[PDB]
């Protein structure tokens, strides 16, 4: 026409120049007659103008045009098994997100896509609706109202062509369940597209090992009600006839290992063809060829059937890949842990040939120490390399130290404050220490202990220990006399076998005893040494300082430390007096446990725990009582108090005393917990238990105090059972438990709820 | 107590396939790579069969080779066993 | 919570020198990738903590 200029009104988010550019007509030139069509197609090709209204005065074009309002917040109402993040993902898949304008009319198609997702779950009756909220500044909010309806169960699982061999109960091996016992209640019946796909191959696998080789599927058909309430599923198959194998052979390059594969393929004649046996056999070959140093061969297993006699001859073919070696190793995870620390568990070495087996021994040795949370191995091929290879060992670290806190809970340190801390990966080095300082304002007990497990290469261990201790509580004058004592321990440690370890070392102690009660079992010892200063005296006092020797034996074979699942760990210690000393005796303690799963898959597991304790003197003499055993404290015996177990002393009745005979165990049922997700489910452990223990002395007699009971007997057995929660937290391990005792006697005590914080399995 | 291997494997009849006037690639297809290789000139290669198992007992073979600019041999040296 | 002092970074903590390497008589050094290396440049102006990060 004749327009000379353009003005726009109602655009608050976009340039007018681009607007007038999207149409060919412009200001400063003769515009055309298509200007209305150009305004139309451009302003609605933008997708950012909801309505346009353009008019020409004769010299100037006035455009009155709005901009499509843009979404601010996308909100959800009616979520019950569905999370808004995946829904926003589905929206971005739609092509829609916050800060975008739109038509307000694809809402129906949007609802349909949402409902298609809902179909993908297994609900088809639902209905969704939008709630639009107009807002100034050309804005909107949007909310989503849902009515999910309900899903279906499955009603029958009926199968075709399954004659002459039933599975209509043996189907129960599937993921899916078309029957929920009212006496085995859990879960319900729900369909899924893919769990189907899994159980189908499962069923195939079943028939593949009972003497069949042609069990094929025709089809799989499913439908359901018009009211969409329950499903009807069917599947169409063949059943051919039974089958057998007839001989086996191979082919391909080796290094003359024919006689070994000969053993893995080895069979008896006249046996049923399988395919799982086949597969594990293949992989066993792969393991062997790992060991001799191969990674990437190829393997093929071909049935050569004769259905004329229902037999097969299994042709096999291998292609031994060209040899490899290793070049390099690299580690990731180490932020708080030095290098050279993990190589000293690699029984593999760098820069030489290779197996596939040293790798796993290293995995084991690593997961033992608990310096890592989790593990990952891998194996690459180097670029531009047929034979050179590298490796990776990744980990996730863990903070593993502690902060012990003894308060004399249960009165084995009475009213006291035992503080202290332990860490075995001290500052990320292979170095281990532990400390306590103990104060009561009259009591002292401080102790240090240290070990370098790798003083020298090849797992050479070296440890020291020291303790100072003062005890001042006989101004109570109740029991448990005043002692001061201090000493040292030193130790070597080393292995000989690649799992089993030994150690030994020495010690020196110094002891000072004061304000002895008139307790009765003591004077047994006091005759044993010699002199007897009794009447009823309390100026009583004594001293003795002694050298000594000890040693340790170790069988450790686990999947790992830090909440293991498999194997067993046992440690024995024998300690002994030595000559040139104030006394003579010897004791031994053993601590045992073993982990066995169901399958280590869902982790339905059991542990067994036991301890043994014994000791005796020499020369017809007895050992001291302060080196006695003890029990109780709800770490060793759950549902009982600290050092509150077993026999007890008198003067002419209470307050158990410890001794020299022990036999104690606890048998468990290990459990997962469904109420928490993996994120910490890896790091928590719950169980039930059933605990036994009993105690006595051999030096104890009953011919003289016989109106008082026996304590020599191994009878009078302590029994309880309960439940325990065990959970990791940044301060160390943590555990609670609640039990119920069911065999007490007199002279004893306990609690039901108990707490522990340290290192005890 | 520990065990160690180190070096390049041997077939010991591979050795009966070695003739001067043969490209390095022929030995590549023969062996796979070497690992020790002169970073001071004199195009040459090394091949060794060391192992140290047991509290005692030690062994090592060696073959040591030098070639032309052509990536083809000039001369060898079999040290079958250390001393 | 919401105030801590186990990390106080953005500190210049270096002093380190550099040196370069001769060759022997006769025979030869080993070759270099150049992948890790120093395109030399005149250093000047701000450096170390005496330095800006307050953005533009």
């Amino acid at each position: 026409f004749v327009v000379k200029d353009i003005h726009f009104e109602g655009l608050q988010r976009v340039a007018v120049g681009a607007a007038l550019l999207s149409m060919p007509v412009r200001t400063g030139d003769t515009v055309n007659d298509e200007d209305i069509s150009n305004t139309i197609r451009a302003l609605f090709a933008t997708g950012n103008f909801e309505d346009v209204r353009v008019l020409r005065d004769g010299d100037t074009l006035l455009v009155q045009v709005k901009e499509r309002p843009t979404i601010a917040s996308i909100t959800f109402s009616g979520n019950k098994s569905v999370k808004d993040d995946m829904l926003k993902q589905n929206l971005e898949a739609s092509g829609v997100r916050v800060g975008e304008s739109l038509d307000r009319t694809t809402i129906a198609d949007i609802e349909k896509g949402l409902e298609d997702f809902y179909y993908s779950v297994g609900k088809y009756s639902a209905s969704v609706k939008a709630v639009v909220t107009p807002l100034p500044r050309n804005r909107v909010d949007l909310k989503l109202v849902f009515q999910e309806g309900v899903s279906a169960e499955i009603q029958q699982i009926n199968i075709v062509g399954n004659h002459a061999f039933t599975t209509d109960e043996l189907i129960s091996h599937f993921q899916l369940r078309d029957e929920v016992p009212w006496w085995n209640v859990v879960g319900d019946r729900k369909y899924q597209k893919q769990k189907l796909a899994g159980d189908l191959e499962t069923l195939r696998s079943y028939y593949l090992d009972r003497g069949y080789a042609r069990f094929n599927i025709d089809s799989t058909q499913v439908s359901l009600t018009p009211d969409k309430k329950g499903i009807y599923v069917t599947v169409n198959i063949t059943e051919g006839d039974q089958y057998k194998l007839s001989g086996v052979e191979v082919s391909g390059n080796l290094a003359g290992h024919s006689a070994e594969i000969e053993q893995l393929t080895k069979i008896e004649p006249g046996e049923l063809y399988n395919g799982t046996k086949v597969t594990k056999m293949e992989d066993d070959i792969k393991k062997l060829l790992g060991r001799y140093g191969y990674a990437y061969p190829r393997v093929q297993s071909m049935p050569e059937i004769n259905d004329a006699d229902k037999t097969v001859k299994l042709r096999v073919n291998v292609d031994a890949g060209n040899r490899f070696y290793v070049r390099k190793i690299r580690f990731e995870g180490n932020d708080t842990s030095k290098d050279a620390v993990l190589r000293r568990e690699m029984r593999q070495m760098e820069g030489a040939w290779l197996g596939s087996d040293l790798v796993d021994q290293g995995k084991e040795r690593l997961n033992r120490l608990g310096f890592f949370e989790t593990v990952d191995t891998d194996t690459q091929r180097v670029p531009g390399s047929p034979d050179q290879v590298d490796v990776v060992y990744k980990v996730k670290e863990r903070n593993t130290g502690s902060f012990n806190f003894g308060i004399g809970y249960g009165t084995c340190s009475g009213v006291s404050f035992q503080a202290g801390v332990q860490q075995d990966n001290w500052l990320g080095t292979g170095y281990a220490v532990g400390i306590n300082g103990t104060k009561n304002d009259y009591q002292t007990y401080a102790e240090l202990s240290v070990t370098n497990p790798y003083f020298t290469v090849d797992g050479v261990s070296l440890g020291g220990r020291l303790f100072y201790n003062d005890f001042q509580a006989d101004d109570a004058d109740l029991s448990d006399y005043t002692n001061k004592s201090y000493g040292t321990d030193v130790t070597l440690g080393f292995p000989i076998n690649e799992y089993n370890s030994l150690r030994a070392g020495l010690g020196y102690v110094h002891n000072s005893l004061s304000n002895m009660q008139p307790q009765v079992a003591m004077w047994r010892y006091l005759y044993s040494m010699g002199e007897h200063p009794s009447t009823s005296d309390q100026d009583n006092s004594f001293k003795t300082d002694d050298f000594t020797f000890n040693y340790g034996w170790t069988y450790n074979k686990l999947d790992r430390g830090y909440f293991p699942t498999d194997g067993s760990r046992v440690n024995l210690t024998g300690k002994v007096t030595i000559p040139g000393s104030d006394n003579e005796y010897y004791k031994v303690t053993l601590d045992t446990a073993t982990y066995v799963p169901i399958d280590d898959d869902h982790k339905w597991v059991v542990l067994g725990r036991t301890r043994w304790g014994y000791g005796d003197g020499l020369g017809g003499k007895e050992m001291p009582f302060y080196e006695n055993f003890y029990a109780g404290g709800s770490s060793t015996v759950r549902g009982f108090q600290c050092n509150t177990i077993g026999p007890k002393a008198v003067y002419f009745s209470d307050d158990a005393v410890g001794g020299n005979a022990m036999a104690v165990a606890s048998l468990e049922f290990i459990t997962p917990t469904p109420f928490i997700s993996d994120k910490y489910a890896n790091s928590v452990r719950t169980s039930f238990f059933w605990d036994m223990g009993t105690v006595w002395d051999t030096n104890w007699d009953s011919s003289q105090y016989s109106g008082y009971p026996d304590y020599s007997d191994p009878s009078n057995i302590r029994m309880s059972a309960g439940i325990a929660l065990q959970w990791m937290s940044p301060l160390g391990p943590l555990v609670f438990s609640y039990a119920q005792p069911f065999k007490k006697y007199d002279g004893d005590k306990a609690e039901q709820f108990q707490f522990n914080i340290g290192k005890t399995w | 107590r520990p065990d160690i291997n180190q070096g390049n494997y041997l077939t010991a009849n591979d050795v009966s396939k070695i003739r001067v006037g043969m490209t390095q690639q022929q030995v590549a297809y023969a062996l796979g790579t070497p690992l020790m290789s002169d970073p001071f000139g004199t195009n040459t290669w090394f091949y060794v069969f060391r192992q140290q198992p047991g509290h005692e007992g030690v062994t090592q073979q060696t073959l040591t080779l030098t070639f032309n600019s052509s990536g083809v041999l000039t001369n060898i040296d079999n040290k079958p066993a250390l001393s | 919570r919401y105030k801590r002092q186990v990390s106080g970074d953005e500190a210049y903590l270096e002093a380190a020198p550099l040196a370069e390497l001769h060759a022997p008589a006769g025979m030869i050094l080993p070759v270099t990738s150049g992948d890790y290396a120093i395109p030399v440049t005149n250093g000047s102006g701000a450096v170390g903590k005496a330095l800006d990060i307050r953005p533009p």
């Binding site: 990731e332 180490n334 708080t336 290098d339 | 160690i4 | 186990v6 550099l18 440049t41 990060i53 953005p55």
Partner: protein, 218 residues
């Protein structure tokens, strides 16, 4: 979480920045993103967010922010800020003093972060040799050079104490091909001098003799 026009919001953003306050400016800036994800000064907003992540040290968020930015903004003059800040991130990612109390060697840990830092500073120089970010960046690259050297040196020590007489040297040839500097490297030749003689390789020990004799005192 108020809702307002963005001008006052960026205003209080600047205010809280001058306050040294992160936890307030943090949410302010996240709301500036979400409320105005295509504002006219969006880029400055991204910068301020990464500055926030540094001054409060939520690091991998900042890493993601930077690679987001460089993906989406490939080109503008302040890019140098971006690259340098990335490398500073990973430089921090290596370091710590949770263990440092005047006594730790931070060496001998997972070094890949340093390699990323190396590449980052290097790239930024190679695109932008001339800025006001470089006079220290060079020296920091030198730091990482020394550290990567020391990493391998320590591994050499352990393998050497075993007697992996050869895999060591296969490491060290690469130590040479990469690191012609760093006295440790000069201090590491003698390990070969022991090695080749443990190998009963005489004919290369003289090469070791020459190189050591070729060098003066370390």
């Amino acid at each position: 979480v108020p809702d307002n026009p963005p001008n006052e919001i960026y205003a209080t953003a600047q205010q809280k920045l001058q306050d040294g306050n992160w936890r307030q400016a943090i949410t302010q800036l996240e709301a500036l993103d979400n409320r105005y994800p295509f504002g006219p000064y969006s880029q400055q907003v991204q910068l301020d967010l990464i500055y926030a992540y540094y001054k409060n040290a939520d690091l991998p968020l900042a890493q993601a922010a930077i690679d987001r930015f460089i993906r989406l903004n490939p080109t503008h003059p302040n890019i140098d800020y971006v690259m340098y800040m990335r490398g500073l991130t990973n430089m921090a990612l290596d370091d710590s003093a949770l263990q440092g109390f005047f006594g730790v060697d931070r060496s001998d840990r997972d070094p890949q972060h340093a390699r990323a830092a190396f590449s980052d500073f290097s790239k930024l120089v190679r695109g932008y040799p001339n800025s006001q970010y470089t006079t220290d960046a060079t020296k920091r690259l030198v730091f990482l050079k020394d550290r990567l050297a020391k990493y391998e040196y320590s591994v050499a020590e352990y393998y050497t104490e075993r007697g992996a007489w050869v895999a060591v040297v296969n490491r060290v040839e690469g130590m040479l091909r990469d690191y012609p500097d760093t006295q440790a490297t000069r201090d590491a030749l003698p390990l070969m001098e022991n090695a080749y003689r443990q190998m009963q390789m005489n004919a290369q020990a003289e090469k070791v003799a020459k190189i050591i004799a070729a060098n003066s005192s370390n």
